[PDB]
A paper describes a structure:
Tegumental protein of 20.8 kDa from Clonorchis sinensis elicits IgA immune responses in the host and does not cause an IgG response. For this reason, we named the 20.8-kDa tegumental protein from Clonorchis sinensis as CsTAL3. The interesting thing is that similar results were reported for SmTAL2 and FhCaBP2, 40. Both proteins belong to the TAL protein family of the class of fluke proteins that consist of a calmodulin like domain (or N-terminal domain) and a DLC-like domain (or C-terminal domain) as in CsTAL3. In this work, we determined 2.6 Å crystal structure of the DLC-like domain (amino acid [aa] positions 83–177) and 1.3 Å crystal structure of the calmodulin like domain (aa positions 1–81) of CsTAL3.
Due to cleavage of the full-length protein, we had grown a crystal of the calmodulin like domain (aa 1–81) of CsTAL3. The initial phase determination and model building were carried out by the SAD method with an anomalous signal of one selenomethionine. The structure of the calmodulin like domain is composed of five α-helices. The α1 to α4 helices are classical EF-hand motifs where two helix-loop-helix structures and two short antiparallel β-sheets (β1 and β2) are connecting the Ca2+-binding loops. Ca2+-binding motif 1 (CB1, residues 12–23) is a Ca2+-binding loop that contains 12 partially conserved residues starting with N-terminal aspartate and ending with C-terminal glutamate as in the EF-hand motif of other calmodulin like proteins. One Ca2+ ion binds to CB1 via D12, D14, T16, V18, E23, and a water molecule (positions X, Y, Z, −Y, −Z, and −X, respectively) in a geometrical pattern of a pentagonal bipyramid. Other residues bind a Ca2+ ion via their side chain carboxyl groups, but V18 (–Y position) binds to a Ca2+ ion via its main-chain carbonyl oxygen atom. Moreover, CB2 structure appears to be similar to that of CB1, but a Ca2+ ion is absent in our structure. A significant difference is that the –Z position of CB1. This position is glutamate in the other EF-hand motif, but the –Z position of CB2 is threonine (T57). The molecule shows structural similarities with the calmodulin like domain of a family of soluble Ca2+ sensor Kv-channel-interacting proteins (KChIPs) and of the short Ca2+-binding mitochondrial carrier (SCaMC) with r.m.s. deviation 1.8 Å and 2.8 Å, when 60 Cα and 62 Cα atoms are aligned, and DALI server Z-scores 8.2 and 8.146, respectively.
Numbering used by the authors: 2 to 81
The structure:
Amino acid sequence: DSFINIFVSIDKDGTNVISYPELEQYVAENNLDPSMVEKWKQLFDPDNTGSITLETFCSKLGLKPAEIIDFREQKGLHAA
Ligand SMILES: [Ca+2]
């Protein structure tokens, strides 16, 4: 899946802030390497703010927030 998709999957409450527990739950539930947590923090929370915003995620990856929002609206609709 795309980074757009994975962001929406991790951010299960839709706040457009990935909390560290959200990230950690995704890693464990998908049997990923726990080092993944540190990599996301380093790439997407470089200033160590304590969470990962949609804004910083998008700036690092060259995405716009509008792309995650579209996907979120489509996922919701599709799911229904
Ligand atoms: Ca969240």
